[PDB]
Amino acid sequence: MSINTTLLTPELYQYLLQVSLREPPLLAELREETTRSFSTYAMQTAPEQAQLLALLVKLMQAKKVIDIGTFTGYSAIAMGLALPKDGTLITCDVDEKSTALAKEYWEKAGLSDKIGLRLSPAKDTLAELIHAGQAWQYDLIYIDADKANTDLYYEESLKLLREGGLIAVDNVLRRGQVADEENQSENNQLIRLFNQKVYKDERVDMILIPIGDGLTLARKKS
Amino acid sequence: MSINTTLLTPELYQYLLQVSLREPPLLAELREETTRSFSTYAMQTAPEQAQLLALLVKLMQAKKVIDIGTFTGYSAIAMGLALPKDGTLITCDVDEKSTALAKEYWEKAGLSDKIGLRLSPAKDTLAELIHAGQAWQYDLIYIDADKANTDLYYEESLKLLREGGLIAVDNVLRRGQVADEENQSENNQLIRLFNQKVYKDERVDMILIPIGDGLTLARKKS
Ligand SMILES: Nc1ncnc2c1ncn2[C@@H]1O[C@H](CSCC[C@H](N)C(=O)O)[C@@H](O)[C@H]1O
Ligand SMILES: Nc1ncnc2c1ncn2[C@@H]1O[C@H](CSCC[C@H](N)C(=O)O)[C@@H](O)[C@H]1O
Numbered sequence: 001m002s003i004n005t006t007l008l009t010p011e012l013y014q015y016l017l018q019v020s021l022r023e024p025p026l027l028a029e030l031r032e033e034t035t036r037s038f039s040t041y042a043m044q045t046a047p048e049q050a051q052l053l054a055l056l057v058k059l060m061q062a063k064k065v066i067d068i069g070t071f072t073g074y075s076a077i078a079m080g081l082a083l084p085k086d087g088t089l090i091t092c093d094v095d096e097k098s099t100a101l102a103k104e105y106w107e108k109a110g111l112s113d114k115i116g117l118r119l120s121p122a123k124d125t126l127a128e129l130i131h132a133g134q135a136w137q138y139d140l141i142y143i144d145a146d147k148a149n150t151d152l153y154y155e156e157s158l159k160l161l162r163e164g165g166l167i168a169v170d171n172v173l174r175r176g177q178v179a180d181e182e183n184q185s186e187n188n189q190l191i192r193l194f195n196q197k198v199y200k201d202e203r204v205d206m207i208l209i210p211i212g213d214g215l216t217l218a219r220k221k222s
Numbered sequence: 223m224s225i226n227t228t229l230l231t232p233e234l235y236q237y238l239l240q241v242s243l244r245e246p247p248l249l250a251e252l253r254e255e256t257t258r259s260f261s262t263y264a265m266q267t268a269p270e271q272a273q274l275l276a277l278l279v280k281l282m283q284a285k286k287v288i289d290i291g292t293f294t295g296y297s298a299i300a301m302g303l304a305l306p307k308d309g310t311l312i313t314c315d316v317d318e319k320s321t322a323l324a325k326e327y328w329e330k331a332g333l334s335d336k337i338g339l340r341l342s343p344a345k346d347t348l349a350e351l352i353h354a355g356q357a358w359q360y361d362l363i364y365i366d367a368d369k370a371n372t373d374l375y376y377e378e379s380l381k382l383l384r385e386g387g388l389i390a391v392d393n394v395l396r397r398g399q400v401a402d403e404e405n406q407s408e409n410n411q412l413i414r415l416f417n418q419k420v421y422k423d424e425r426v427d428m429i430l431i432p433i434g435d436g437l438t439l440a441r442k443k444s
């Protein structure tokens with residue numbers, strides 16, 4: 001047999017949200033506003049995927065988190081709220097307009113002391129962190145920015161992760177396009193190439209969760 | 223918007239397995255044999271769901287695991303292989319025929335020292351564990367036996383879990399039947415009632431993963 005997983009219909013999907021999604025009112029408000037104010041609202045993290053991220057922070061008791069791709073800060077705040085008392089999260093983006101709203105909401109959430117915005121190319125922020133002796137220091141890294149650079153960000157995130165640290169990568173399924181070998185758009189070929197790379201990568205243990213637009217988890221092995 | 227998750231088609235599902243499923247040959251062999259020898263083969267844990275369980279053992283560095291519902295021992299071995307050097311897993315079932323094959327395979331896997339079979343009603347094994355001072359001692363409990371007793375097993379698993387411990391429950395989606403409020407079969411109403419109970423339970427943080435027949439994760443809060 002196989003299929004061996006119960007596939008989601010719109011019916012089943014809605015039921016799942018009804019018995020699982022516990023969105024904090026502040027985050028709910030944050031995406032109502034993101035929808036209202038940003039034409040790019042759709043690149044926002046799925047409430048259910050973010051909730052899984054929050055659960056991972058708690059399970060690992062992650063004290064050092066990186067959030068690559070702030071936008072209006074949904075995932076940054078989702079994980080921020082799950083941080084233990086002494087935990088910190090730095091969030092990366094290059095867009096001032098969206099991050100300004102992010103700051104606003106994570107202040108309103110009481111996370112100004114835990115979350116710090118690094119406004120500049122993530123490529124640069126990651127290289128500074130390494131070239132400043134932070135390799136092996138991070139527990140959890142969430143990669144959700146420009147897709148062209150996911151391999152770079154992944155490679156850098158490995159260096160920065162402690163032993164047993166976790167990489168989470170969003171949008172690995174590309175709304176299904178990734179299964180169409182003939183789609184052939186630049187970004188689609190990059191993600192197809194990337195998914196095979198991670199699947200073969202013996203530096204990690206991994207899994208691909210069909211939540212949000214697909215969430216790959218890669219644990220850095222001993 | 224919403225749907226907010228990329229739903230799995232058979233096409234996408236197959237692609238997902240191709241870029242994520244890393245089944246150990248021994249486990250592959252175990253389910254070929256289970257299919258061949260057991261008319262009840264279908265209640266076996268999905269390779270991809272088991273793989274997620276293995277990843278959770280590693281992330282938590284779980285040293286004490288319970289496996290409720292051995293069958294031919296797929297999940298017991300999947301998690302067993304991920305156990306740290308000093309980790310142990312006890313597996314529960316009442317069926318001698320299937321557990322005998324389980325023993326055989328987890329010996330062949332080199333896990334005879336880590337896995338211990340408790341052959342008797344899980345209800346009894348769990349009560350012994352508690353009535354013998356093991357409350358708060360376990361890291362991860364996987365509930366996958368008789369569905370009529372999932373609430374009982376859940377309730378007992380909370381007592382046995384350490385702070386920050388994890389309950390994993392399989393078959394919460396019931397191949398979709400659970401979304402049909404008018405299905406009404408005894409077991410379907412029990413799981414619908416259970417899913418709402420967990421969703422409302424403030425003793426845990428939870429998430430429902432659409433992998434296998436649905437996997438609910440509930441972390442015991444501080
Ligand atoms: N070179 C770069 N460095 C940092 N951020 C970048 C970048 N290129 C694009 N981005 C940002 O990556 C973001 C993609 S979407 C962000 C999603 C976010 N996790 C959420 O919860 O909503 C955009 O905000 C975009 O501005
Ligand atoms: N009261 C009970 N106590 C313990 N096990 C029980 C039980 N009632 C049913 N079971 C067992 O629960 C199992 C259900 S299926 C087991 C799935 C297993 N996790 C795997 O990886 O394949 C059956 O083997 C059945 O024998």
Ligand code: NI
Nearest residue numbers: 043144170171
């Ligand atoms: Ni995204």
Ligand code: NI
Nearest residue numbers: 265366392393
């Ligand atoms: Ni099952």
